[model samples]
Target chain A: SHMRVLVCGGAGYIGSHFVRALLRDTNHSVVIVDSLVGTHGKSDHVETRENVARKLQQSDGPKPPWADRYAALEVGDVRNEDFLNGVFTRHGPIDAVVHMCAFLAVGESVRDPLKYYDNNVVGILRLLQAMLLHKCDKIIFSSSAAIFGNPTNAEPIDINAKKSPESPYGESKLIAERMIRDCAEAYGIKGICLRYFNACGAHEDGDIGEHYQGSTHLIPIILGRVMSDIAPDDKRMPIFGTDYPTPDGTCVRDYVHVCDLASAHILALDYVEKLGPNDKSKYFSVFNLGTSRGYSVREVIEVARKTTGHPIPVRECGRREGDPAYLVAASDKAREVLGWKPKYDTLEAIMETSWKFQRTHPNGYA
Target chain B: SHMRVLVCGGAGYIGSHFVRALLRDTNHSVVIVDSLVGTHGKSDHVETRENVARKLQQSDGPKPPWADRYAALEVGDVRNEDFLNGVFTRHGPIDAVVHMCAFLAVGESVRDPLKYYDNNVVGILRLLQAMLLHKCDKIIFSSSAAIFGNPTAEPIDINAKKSPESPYGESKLIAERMIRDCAEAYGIKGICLRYFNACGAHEDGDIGEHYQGSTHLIPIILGRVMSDIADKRMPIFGTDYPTPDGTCVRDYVHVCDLASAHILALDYVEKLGPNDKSKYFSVFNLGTSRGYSVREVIEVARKTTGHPIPVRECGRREGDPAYLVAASDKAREVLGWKPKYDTLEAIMETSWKFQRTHPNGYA
Candidate 1:
């Protein structure tokens, strides 16, 4: 528990939430290195402002229970060996690593695979080399549900579900996982890859809500569009794909709260050290952080409309190219093993908290 | 055609032969950048007194038919950019390239993949980067029959063979090929010379036979073993393999015969320039000269046994890992348009002539 956890993508959406959760629960020392690209998107993500504010707040509202507050931030690209080397030199004797730094844009990834190759593949390779050189072998990799492309009629998509990604964004994640496994086999390294489905919502009862630029999440975008108090004229609510075999003629997917996913990392780290016996990581796992109920796109929109008290509009569209009919994760592994549960498991509950947070801060974190 | 050609592994076995052949026939100038690793066992392989004499005498040989001679031997490693850059700067606008550099050891490749990755993969990558920097597009890579990995029975094995046994040797070749093909698709530049069993005599008949720690066809070993001129204690032969009747099978890949494969370069250069296609030089073909059965080993061994035949034989011994296998070069696309051939094609005669020319072999 006293291990100094180095969260690589600590300032990004899911990573920042994890950073804060680690502090709130454990007596462990935590430091961050986020490269800051994803979180600093035109300066709208609340994690950025919240992190900035957390440093200034004298009044601790459930602060991370750390013995020492050395959550220092070192800003640099992961590809730069000198920068990574310096980070390692400064923070030597570091125990475990939480790697979340990646180019996650599915659209951009398709335009140019080299961009994905350089950022995701080459960048991670450099990080791994640096880790090995510094002898910090334990790591927790952020895999994705995207790798599965789209799940099938199997209501509860198990880890054994097919993985054949369509876009470079998905392929990059899959290949990165392959590289991690290969490197572990070749070099004495161990890591757990947590496959996240759809990471939505935020922490502290939505006090820290999902804030991203040109935000892509359904719940937040729905809340933002419905209120119209923010974008009074913007009313183009795109229901990505609608002609699927579902009841509402829309695709269905699991929506997991961000905080719950972050908590799983703590359990993952413990499992790695205590349970691992072979060359591969002990706590190596693939969990679909789902409510186990595949909610249709229209259902999420309707739930957001009801929760926010804003009945805006309705429209139908064609089937999205990469969208499957339904996808629901089997979260029994996470629940049984780590005692992890999605507090906001239902679509209504998840939306209410996010809506409440958005209502509280119409314009995210000042 | 005025562009200078940088032949990377231009100092080794087949490479040196190719180098000699290029200078004799072509108008384009030549610059050699070899680490001499291929010929590392032989100190005489460098531009020492012996090799120079051998190279010079061979220059006048029949295949070259050189009325005169000119070739610049620069001490360089293909992996080093500075060295390659210096060559590029001095005599560049590299029209076409013959990349003959590679670790040709199947056994060593199987034992150590890291070494193979370092030398083969990384070196080729660096070379390509340099070529891109220098605006050099055309390249003739030295690939081998080892890539085929013994496939199922087929009439004509053409170009679509899938796997290889060793990761170190096979995977590196596969990766390089993939990278080249990808680059070609990306419209950068590349091509591969997928060589099969290459063994035959050079028409030169002068610098025909000379290999220091050789693991190929009859030459110094045959001379030493057959004539009792050299010690019998130094010879080692493996005569066990699961062939037609069980004697190690092999393709007597001739070094001089490999020389003509370079003429495919001229057509590639001309085509790439005319078409403005500066990404892939992919002239894929398996050029195997003669397929010799495993029984040929014993036949050759029997021919020389009377002189220096010291039998040191055990049960096959799982020896050397790679065996002499057959190949199909019927898909030699370059031959349809461009051709580089020599009139003299007698294998045994040329072999005897070359071996006779340098019995002691530039020693």
Candidate 2:
């Protein structure tokens, strides 16, 4: 049961990992669609093409068995109807589409909401229209935990939690989800939304990794500081808030491995594929992809120190606005329904994978 | 103080009426921007221009003093950035913008949600972008009571739980939130008027409800009576609701009253000067605060038209709430709006006159 999948934003960190998994693990063919705006000042498309080429070659020397299964990389914006329709027409009878093209900066989204709404909300609208025109009805959306803004209680969040987005980024995501749901009800399109919580780590092979300039995630910042060759200065990791109501008075979050998140997408693709054409009972489902375990900022810093043998100095600072005390996920549904079992379930294991990539590509695909 | 205004969708039913009221009541000059897609299969732009021309002339013959205040009609869609920016550039330093461009069919929105979202949501986005670019920082948005999908309590006020049941309702709510966010991020002032069942017509009898394929109760009943068809039975959607009359009840506010409320809202926006640093975002429910049952409306139409407008009761329609009345205390107190045609008879007489005059709706 081989399928041809169209992965939008297949040049980004998580999207590249998912594309790698699709080609490495399955007998499926892949077509990459990326705008490659270089918001991070890096040519991700060049790195993605090189990584795909590297993965196609055999470990010994020659090409592998699935070398020719990789399709062409189409560079265009998803918001343009003609660009999206071109992709579907060129790669006709596309089995499914995985949409991951969205702006994710919360503070920026708050300041410039129209940018977020246009790119995120209108992006999905255009993609769905193209899909309907091309008769492609299956999609897997890349959602985030930001949709659950400042959960009232410290308990683990689930699918049924109240969705009151605090920033325009989250609002755009929720609006896309609602639009998908409405499309499913109206056109019988099957959709699965995976709400990932803090996707970190790199590929185990270390051939491709997170390459964004001035990265903002917790793991990437710490890893960048550790891998720096300059002598230690007065600069230290400034903790946003150490007075929260958690165990160490720091924010707690669920850090899931990016590879694990990639695996869940494959399973989701399989789930949607198995649905019969006449079986319209279940058209949409949402799953939270996490380890179901909570880890504090202090815990993550300590794990990074052990992984890279660096002290990883810190500085306590005042609380940032809209910083929740804790955000852990209750991912029992994904585990039970999709039969997902994360390989890297510990903070040490996740940090080790990220450390390996940082040690090799300190300049990040330059 | 005289000001220049840009009215989007100024060729439609309520929008044309609002344009007339703005010209006749205030010294404000109006430049209309209407796409006039003719989704209803009529040249609303021509009709609107004619109506404005007619309204400008004196009762005797010659033009009145305020005839030049009616500016040119720029035809364009609100979703196109270039078109909207051209309008703002051509009419620089617009005092305020009144946005009324939207798709209003609930069932059509369900079948094609993307069309509604693209037209309604993206329309506001482009308009706001143009406003910000041109330094026009005040807007009066024409919202609907559908934002409050199904009321939990009677007489929904300005502050009510909003969970839209259809895409049409959701699009309006999203647009309102976008405006509020813009007002906070930028220095724009916004006022949203949540109109509940805008009915009736203009008092002049020239411009009224001429919507082709209209599903409204008054227009449908009037059409049935005007056709003089043998089947005089008007199809009533529901009759076994939990209301007093065993039918759905709604707040029917006259279009003229709604037009007046927009004027007051514009004045309210203009009163806040540029130096006023206070954040301004206000919402008001525009209605007569009186509920009219289906049976009551039919009875009034029968008396007003001198015809026994018979109705055939049918099963309850899906998503039809028993009662959807408005509590317009905030509009009354804040905007100082008063409904002149408060009774059903007053509303029915205007509609009956318009139907008799234009039996074939702006054809």
Candidate 3:
């Protein structure tokens, strides 16, 4: 059945992709609610808002094929109860919420934890309260593999992995997950926490892509350097540590394409919808979204060089605090349960989509 | 050094006792901030406020020897930044904060988790922010043994593994972690007193456990035995647990002893030099390191109050740990804290006196 979903952070990179996927792949109508502040609270909102407007545009006008199915972006913070309640009341009878608004800079979180807790922890509290008030019982949260901290073993992290977050950002997300679990048990709110490993890449059409004021992700930094020719002396990328006891002595991570991450949210929405609210045993679920693979820092740079044909500069530095040696995921649960099949499994395919977006919009929706 | 202190939630049972300890024993002047709502948000405050005023008064004219030291009750919620900021602004150069505001009911917390999260977790966040803004670095927070949900070991210590079973317990643990993080990041000196079943009343018997709907074991027992009301029997949940007496066991520390530890904690924080920022957080579990079973407690109440204290054996309540005894060696060694009411009898006597005097709990 078609549903009206409220996407809390539907202007960011992963969130906007999910919004696009919902409009294109399913008949589900969407209501976008975002403060338009970047995840770190330092980025501008003009380009992100323009990009969202461009995606919602049709050839005839600024309306899509299913014009009545979509609602324009509602610019507001999720932490404000009145703003969320208004969204639910105005664009309402909202079936579910896709909450992606969270402060995610690990270093910044360490320096200032209140920002992370207020936005991530208090954000979920307010959103969930608003949902229960509106009688919307379904939610899909954007959790992270950081919740696993550094696993004692070298195995792929699973849903039941010992959760000891290394930073406030990770701690905030874990706390939010626990709050959602408690809400599901107490209030019968069905929730699915998707523990994403590393969300990368962009849409195939290159309409919208990742953009933060001061970007920190490995892919965008590499792609940005490739788009802008830099001086030979400048160090384009700094590998934190080269003696991490891995294949290339660099940290290994499981990189999942943004499209695959978006698809998993759609499948998760469907999965949660089937469960009855009164079914206490089946109200809460968690899944790891990754390709069950690992790529080191050097390996990712190699792929970036091949994709954009630029010898991306690199600098070696001491190990950053809390950087784990390896972080790969075991997505068997998502595959078997939600029928998730990640199309961009290889680093080449993932980099190609990112490169396409970078090549088309060098300045990124500016 | 004479200091001005902000005592949040200082109108409640344990808070009032702490405020009295600060006034009677130390040179610290108190500025009490309370919403006057009980820990569970279902209590009236008129009697509590009157009791606080009575304690602050000397016999002469409602003014005491240290009348200048004690400020009247400042009724406000800790979750409100403006309210706390105003308290800090009005009471300038406050030395330390004694934060005692928290919800403590496990079953009610399980039914409604947000209330606990908002009051307990958000309450500490706002308080800490206000402390930082006012440059008030030292704080003695009222934490709980509930942080250790159910321990695998017999006597839970400071280093025990924490896995809070209920939202109330989780909120306390979350507050402790936030306090620790704030201490590390902002150089705020934090002392978390992990109280294990705070019971008993003041020695003077003026202000005691004056809860409206008392859920505590001792107060519930005393209330049931004192009242002639027929159907209000004390509930002994889960008599089939694996304990020796087939009942839940807990470490019951006296409220006066609990209050005295805060004074010691305040002195501990005060002694730190301005440049000493290395050790910012200190935690001490306050208990007699003794366990008392539900049956054993009732037996003591029967002896202390000269009543059978009729009880109804009920099914196991959810989240009631079989045994929760504290290992308070750290407090004894570091803070030099010694419980005056160490035995269950001493605790029962004090509690029974309060029940006999104030039968309706300050109503």
Candidate 4:
């Protein structure tokens, strides 16, 4: 029997990629529930409606390849219990949940904690309640490296590293993680929380990538800055912090490809399957998803320069307050436990995928 | 203009007492919204309907002293955003909020954590959202010492605590932390008054402790002692603990004193004034700091009621901490808070006064 998966927010950047991969790799049927409440950019290529709704609404074009496995596409919000619970009742019994919905702006979270808590923390609680009501026992959560505030050292941080979330965005994610753990213990649920450091890149086909109204991540921001239709003078990217303790004096981060994130989700569900069907105890494990390499801002710019082969305009500025000197995730647990390996492991490969998506859909999702 | 206070769980054991005290001590008119979803005792006296509705329903006798000051007691559930939001919209410019709504059964929380998280944790979040929408900043939260779990020392301070042993405690602690963070970000000035076993009754014999299935010590002992309620002796949960007597020890604070602390907390916030809203988040332990054992409490009940309330020993209840007496230095020093009913006898006498009159609880 084919497994049935409920992928919440399955239309956004990571969610859409996960939907495509879940359909491509396995015989499983999926139900994509997207409220479209998230910040999926205003690019012409991006469909702001719920994933399935957008697909059906755009009846003018030929159907996508993976259209056969669309068991259900829902226009739902986790906050509205009836809409979410209805999905479970109608499409279920759902085997597992891939929760990818949340407001991800760290700066905006500081100014408005309620929005983050309501959307991310409480929103997940609503979803958990729905899952429990439907007897769905397994979940693969979309966690973040923000759970670990700025680490003291530049070494690759492990899963058990000190967790001191500096912003409400981090706090909301951390709270939701704890709630999931508690819910697992209370109700017999199995989970794998994937702590992704930075998700970049697109599908190899360049059919999908990050699209946004505004810039957030390094690769997407850099891609838009150098490759957008705007004038070269106006396309200059501002490096938030340049005076760091690193060799290049800039903040450093580890970027994992988006497709790799999708693969980890699949592997996570498979790991749950191998844990046996009769074990009633709540089993949960955490793994950091990264390539175990850190690239400074200057390094990222250098890679983008070579990958895009475009004259990347650059502007230096003061350091962004609270940005750490370096943050690199140790992903050995994923390698060993899930037997997972990233095909596009190189930074250049990640840049190439991102640039391909940017070059094709200049106005985004157009 | 009178300062208006919205008491969320203003119909339960502690919440009702706080409502009465708020009306008695000050001229502040109160608008209480209680789902009355709380357990108010399986005895013959209690009413299952929402507290405000129950009071207004009983139209026969002379009205309670607090009836006049009850500006508008609406029966509503905090979980329902529309109902909660309406309360804020109808009662415009709410001066303060006393959040006391929750499912407080610890054992039940362990068995079914969803109920606890839904009612206590998520329920509070919904209320906080409503508060933000209405722009009501001042709040006094009903926190419990259960958040501390089992403390390493006999006297647990405000900080220096570990994770919770039960889901009920987890919900309280989660709500407290969320409130503090919300205050920091949203300019919602608040205080979490952590009460260590609030047990007692109002000075008047009008209202008192009521639960569907009573697990609390004072009420069970009172019910066991009252001839009309129970013929059997009280069953004590544990006896083998490292204390003066082998019984477990706890810090029991009076309900009236708890009510007074709420008033003082409101005053503290008001005294901070409208302009001086900076540095507004605070937490204080509300306890006498003196620990009383189970045997001592039984003896106190025996003295107050003038009855030999026979005790039956039982196996130790799981998760019952060895000893828990609060470190209430912060509450006293910071808020100028003092327990008016400081003695155990005073606490028991006030409870007995209510128990004796309403022998069957609230019929």
Candidate 5:
């Protein structure tokens, strides 16, 4: 469908992947709104080099599909009303929204909570208000698995799981969901809250990949440490928790491919538009986007060792507070309801695509 | 005992009473920071005529005890940083604060959720930041019983009895949670006094409930029964609430008692001190251990005013609770507080006194 989608924080890793994937599949006219305040990490996150990488792909790949369809990149803070509303003013008659902008650091969120609340909670509220004003009521919110805090058992945590966020970052997401729920009930706004598991891997097509200054995900860090011939101590990956009650004595997290996560957004948007009797979006829907089978830190390490054919050494560290023993998403709702069929559901696919991107952009598109 | 307080919304009804009471007892100084946005209601509420009343009280009734004790009334919105910090700059070190500035209309909250969240939630956050910056670690927030939407319990319960349905309730609940969390993380000692249905006016009647709009039940009833200018019908919402009178049962605590509770909370926190091992952040419901039905309230108003207040029973409003009465035992037990104006007649008498003076509110 030629729906004009307003993709917030569309320049970030998962966001860029979603934007590129959406354009590849459909003729959807997409405009990006990014604050770029969060991209100042000193270490290697592929997103730091997003603008450069997008340009680099022009010569190698068949000219970008979004060149004609991409409307405009409104670069400003997400909380700015004038800039947010100007998206609708400039790109008027917008159909739907994809919200992905947020301050995502769990540790920093606790120390500086006002910053977290201001950026994550208040920023999203501004977007919600702007959307209502412009009549672009349909939205796809980028929620996090962090909101679930921890799971009681190894069983797949459903969308109905109790939300008790440990950090300000997680609380911010949960609060956003609540505010969205309130607005939905009060103002007839339709939306979906996609609570993502550990979003790892990159596009298999080799155009976009995950990037942050100090990369935090398992796959990239594993690839970074394994590939780098720097100081062996620096190359060593530290697993935060090992005394957990898991089979491998480490934290088990459900890792989903970024592309797979991005594809779900398309299905989510369609479902939002076509859910009820009159083809009006459902009031609100929340779905956990993850591969059902959870792999522990050890299991992921083993897979990375096998995929890259490198000895990725690990160092045990004190268990980070609020790190759950096991977090597995019950992702059947997305599959059953949205007709989602994930192509790269396995860790092997995740590792292979990410490893390829790593080999190409060795220093992460710097 | 000698704490310099910053009372936000100090010019409003309950706030002004607290200011007057604080100034009366303690040798402390108070600075008022009110945006006065809520004072612009159409009809004369005591809040609208607050400045005029305070001025009127100076010459007529025994000059306010706060003449010397009262610091500058730095009038501005709480959300503005320069204005807020300027209070600290001009007034020197402020020991404590009382934040009560909020757009408190229940219906207005639902119709404009953004407004409620922005003012109530965001305004408090700004105040919190200013407090931290100025090193005023102790604060007494003006929360409401509305946060506990409709209590299912019999009498008094502890703090966590929340079932907030409307945006107003949600905003209060969220703001309280924010304050508590801040107290835990940051070293700000605080107490949220959730006053249940503060209906009556200042006992002195020199300065009483002068609300601009006629949203409050008692004020509306008083205007309808007593005033010649009240043109609108006083419609009682939902008479099938399954109470003793088949109407909603509300715990109407006196406005003066609400003001008194604020003083008690300030002392409780201050006595605990900044270096107290507990670092206390408490929530207490301020309500007389009693419940009054709508019909009982109307009857009380009729007797108090000696006028037949016309009542129009209408359909229930969408979010109206069947019964909402607080069990304020925790408040008494924890804060060592007690409401002086406990009788139903006492509440109506004070309100009627205020109404008699300003027959058409501040008009």
Candidate 6:
């Protein structure tokens, strides 16, 4: 059966990827509502949409083309209750929502917590309130590895990791997740919070990729430096932490491929939809999406070299205030339930897709 | 020997009585501010000024001769920062403040708790915020024995027995008192005047008493039936109880005598100035003035019988909320600190005064 979806923040990095994934899926038509504020070269779907449109228009266009024609795009703020209500009514029926709109920045959040809380936490609350009023129960909330704070994870980490998120950015995610779960219990809404370690890797076509205004991802930064968009002298990869237990003495994170994360979200939607299948009980799932694996700073740097076909420079430094020593996830639950697996689970795999895109189109869609 | 003071709610029920009492004292001049939103009964000091002036003009006046003085009357909301600033500045210097401004009904509080939390809880927070800004140090906070919400004490106790307040009225007072204590720690001084029990008499001044739109007390109900202001069936005193005494009972507090509790405010200033007392202390002296005890209720009833008094008793109902099964000493501490003792301790003293004067309590 086809699912009607609303992808909030559909213009941003992870959101844009999710939007394209939905477009490629045969059973989903996505309505995109993005504030389009402070985002750079976002909605890689802006490129994807054009590419599909071009391909279809071509007399030599390939057979069995995939794109949801019913996909509609709107520019509106989520905080506007009327806009949300209108979309829910006019969209015919929205089976689920992927709420990814948020202001996420560690340093900025600390200096002004209310700025973060007002937009992220309270903003999500307003969205949930609207959804509850409209009788839309299922939600796929965008959570972050920032919630883990500084977990003492060894290998595959689970959702029950000790949560002491250090910054306001981290705190906002944790608080929003709490509100979503509590509201689920209260309103019988099935919810899922995907605590993502770090998302890297562009779509397979390489037409759409990461485009954040104030970019804060390691893969993108390393690629940008090598790709020469930034001056080589200023092309500094910030080694935030130097005093860790690893051989290289730096922080580590479980970088999950964007494609794998999207699969989990789609399966999450199916899982929630299938939950009341027996009319026995409904479940609220919290998945730790990571390639149950290992990587050190030196190892990721090594992988970056092989994938980028360039000698990536190195510099060692102090910890970035609150960097987790290890944050690799225990994603066995995702494998067991969703029957999903990350084909590109290595740092080498993450770098290959990202560097390929950066090497090809250093600039995102014009 | 003259002292400067600010009276926060000096125009409300017992507050007006305290204001009149302070003006009568040799060195104290009272400034009054009450959120007239609390109730309407002419307790508003703006009207009191004219009512008091007219009574003084008459030869058959009951007005204290000290009324003709510099004790000014002003209206201001405590929550307003600029307004509170103006009151403090215009009043020049305050030796102490008798803070009697708060909603106080345990029953109504439970039903609509937000109003209690917003008004009493948040209202005090705003006042404290303003006080912090002005550095207004000393305060005689109007706390309640309700902090010890139905403790194991038979005589309903003080702070040491504090449990969670069963109602918003109780919760707000305890919370505000705690907040004020925090203020005291940070320099603004405080003292908690926790009234365990207060009943009987006043200055017989008939200024302000239990003038609620409806009665919630035994004496007020008894007085109403006798004065024919209310029907005989209006007294709903529950007759049955778990006590061997076989009747639900509570410590009935008096209105005018409650004014004596404010005397402790003056006493606090004396202690703060020359005596050099400590800045923060949550001292609560159980203040059930002696003439107003439980058994005395029947005595006052017998004492007033045959004078058109209505005496009737129905079957024992569920025990009324009682706490006087034990002894507490809030009154003695105030007395030891030399709280102003009132001459009127009998129920008939002030009730009869209101009847003889306004008769129907201000038409």
RMSD of each: 7.3, 2.9, 3.4, 4.8, 3.8, 11.2
DockQ class, candidate 5: acceptable
**Residue B30 CA displacement from its true place in model 5, Å:** 1.0
Error of 2 at B232 (Å): 6.4
Worst 10 residues of 4 chain B by lDDT: B40-49
lDDT (Cα, tens digit) per residue for candidate 2, span B181-293: 78877878999999988888888787777534786788888888777832558988878888898988889999989999999998899888767765388999988878999
Q: Give the candidates in order of lDDT, highest first.
A: 3, 2, 4, 5, 6, 1
Model 4: residue A233 alpha-carbon error in angstroms: 6.7
Off by over 4 Å in 2: A38-51, A54-69, A229-234, A241-249, A277-279, A316-325, B38-51, B54-58, B61-68, B229-232, B239-246, B273-278, B314-322
For candidate 2 chain B, the 10 contiguous residues with the lowest summed lDDT are B38-47
Clashes of 1: 20
lDDT of each: 0.62, 0.81, 0.81, 0.78, 0.76, 0.63
User: TM-scores, in order shown?
Assistant: 0.66, 0.92, 0.93, 0.87, 0.90, 0.56
Model 4 residue B154 CA deviation (Å) reads 4.4
Spell out the clash pairs found in candidate 3.
none
Give stretches of model 3 more than 4 Å off: A39-69, A230-233, A243-247, B39-69
Worst lDDT 10-window in candidate 6 chain A: A40-49
Per-residue accuracy of model 5 over A1-366 as CA lDDT, tens digit each: 668888888878888788776767877777878866655532123232355455556576576554443436677877778877877789878888899998787766776777777788788778888888988778899999889876434679899887767777887788778778777766778879999988888787664676433776667777777767433545477888888889989989898888888889999988777655454346788999899888999899899889888877889898774566778889989999998877877888788888788767765656
Model 5, which residues run further than 4 Å from truth?
A41-71, A150-154, A229-235, A243-249, A275-281, B41-67, B150-152, B227-232, B240-246, B272-278
CAPRI tier of model 3: medium
Chain A only: TM-score of every candidate? 0.88, 0.92, 0.91, 0.89, 0.90, 0.90
List DockQ for all candidates: 0.12, 0.63, 0.61, 0.43, 0.38, 0.05
Where model 4 places Cα greater than 4 Å from the true spot, the runs are: A39-71, A150-154, A229-235, A241-250, A276-282, A311-313, A316-326, B39-68, B151-154, B227-249, B273-278, B293-323
Tell me the native contact fraction for each prediction: 0.00, 0.40, 0.35, 0.45, 0.07, 0.00
Estimate, for each residue in A96-156, the C-alpha lDDT of model 1 and write its tens digit: 8888888876655554444564577556666667777788877888887778775424467
